């Protein structure tokens, strides 16, 4: 599949702790090039060149209906999550 437009995302449920040392979130998409792949990244605050988002949901995707569900595991410390143009701070452990 092709990548979604990064400028057409909105938070549906902001990231929260899952209860088993992972992070879960939900987004919505207003583009018409569906279905498409969601771009997901995360970095340690001090090292912005290395992706540390270990995904539990493989290849998150926006279908022809519904939103998107994403779950990831992050290393301890201060991190930043990127989903398209959306962003969120997350402190782990």
């Amino acid at each position, epitope marked *: 599949y092709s990548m979604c*437009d*990064k*400028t057409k995302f909105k938070w549906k449920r902001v990231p929260v702790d899952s209860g088993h040392d992972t992070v879960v979130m939900e987004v919505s998409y207003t583009g018409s090039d569906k279905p498409c792949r969601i771009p997901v*990244r*995360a*970095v340690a*605050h001090g090292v*912005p*060149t*290395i*992706n540390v*988002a270990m995904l539990i949901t493989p290849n998150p995707t926006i279908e022809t209906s519904g939103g998107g569900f994403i779950e990831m595991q992050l290393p301890p410390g201060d991190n*930043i999550i*990127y989903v398209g*143009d959306l*962003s*969120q*701070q997350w402190f782990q452990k």
Partner: antibody
Amino acid sequence: EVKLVESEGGLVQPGSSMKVSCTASGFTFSHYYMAWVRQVPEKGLEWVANINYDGTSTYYLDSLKSRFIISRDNANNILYLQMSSLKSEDTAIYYCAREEGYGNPYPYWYFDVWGTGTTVTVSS
Amino acid sequence: QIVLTQSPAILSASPGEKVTMTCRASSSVSYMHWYQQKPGSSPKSWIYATSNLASGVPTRFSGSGSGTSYSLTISRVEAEDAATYYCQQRSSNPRTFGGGTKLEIKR
């Protein structure tokens, strides 16, 4: 939408100083590196400076490192450029710009949003 | 600092035909980026990381290259493509911009 709006420029005498600013809206400002780039008459585009998330690291073009200072105020969504000991060679259009590419090596990074621009003229 | 050579300085083409503009670097780089600028407004991200299209850019555009030679190609030019296009490298400090290629559309 993501938007960057620069302040007013103006005319200044050689050797004097001036401060310009850039106001951001539509995104979480503290989650992006930011930069300044200028367009010089009859020479093209030239990078000036950039700064990390919290302002603890700054980088400059070598021929400008003594005359320019970049800084930011994350709670008020604003980026600054302070100029001093200005020369005539500093007359240009100055653009605010947001960096993108996190999670990849530095050679991958680029400028994904640009400001409207403001003009600074150094003359007697 | 790495010197970037864009050619031609002015590219003139008839509507519907395919065109290619080139950007050569004085030393090797691992990615090249491209920006579009129209008179009276600021530059705009057009292609990033050699071959990825920015949001809103028509799929008639594409980009390619490696090492010391990169390029941007339009499959079928249209009147709204008239503008100046700049290349940029961020592999060596300081980052640098090319001199630009201005695209003219015949009528």
